[PDB]
Amino acid sequence: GSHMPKIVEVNYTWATPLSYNFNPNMIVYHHTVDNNMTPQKIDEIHKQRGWSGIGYHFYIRKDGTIYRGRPENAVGSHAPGVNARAFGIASEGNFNEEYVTPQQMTSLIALSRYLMNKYNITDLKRHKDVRQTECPGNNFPFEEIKAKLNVK
């Protein structure tokens, strides 16, 4: 059946109760702005902001490594107003000033197709499509991702 790319599991200690009332029908793409960040650093920041921990379901570093964030069946903390219906995929970088690496692109396509097939998702969105933000940055290759995934 449909292939799952390599997802690195990360040991988190969740501060507040996770909700599993999560029914995804959307994928939302993010950038981190700051570089150099481990998934554990993101988790620390999101906890400061009052979230249980890392708000993204997945975090893709510059070398293409895909780290798990929130459990795949839990509500995240990445796009208030669509969190109960959206996977959140963050890429390491500030794409107002950077481009995604080739390894990030490879991982973005493989991970998106995995989620789309597993959950019957066709709706791809940038953070800035659902909320007022510059995320995921001017250079984020959204139209190219949609083209490779055959989404109109």
> Residues comprising the binding site?
30, 127, 135
Handedness of CA 39, 42, 48, 54 (dihedral sign): negative
Q: Please, which residues have CB within 8 angstroms of residue 27's CB and are 6 or more apart in sequence?
A: 86, 87, 89, 112, 115, 116, 121, 123, 124, 125
Binding residues for Zn(2+): 30, 127, 135
- For Zn ion, which is the closer residue by CB, 47 or 126? 126
Residue 71 backbone dihedrals phi, psi, to 5 degrees? -55, 150
Q: Return the residue matching tokens 């959307």.
A: 26
Q: Which residues bind Zn ion (CB under 5 A)?
A: 30, 127, 135
Q: How far apart are CA 110 and CA 50, in angstroms?
A: 31
In angstroms, what is the minimal distance from the CB of 127 to Zn ion? Answer: 3
In angstroms, what is the minimal distance from the CB of 135 to Zn ion? Answer: 3
- For Zn ion, which is the closer residue by CB, 30 or 47? 30
In angstroms, what is the minimal distance from the CB of 89 to Zn ion? Answer: 10
- For Zn ion, which is the closer residue by CB, 75 or 135? 135
Q: Please, which residues have CB within 8 angstroms of residue 47's CB and are 6 or more apart in sequence?
A: 15, 53
Order the strands of the 124-126 sheet from edge to edge. Answer: 66-68, 58-60, 86-91, 26-31, 124-126
In angstroms, what is the minimal distance from the CB of 2 to Zn ion? Answer: 27
- For Zn ion, which is the closer residue by CB, 47 or 78? 78
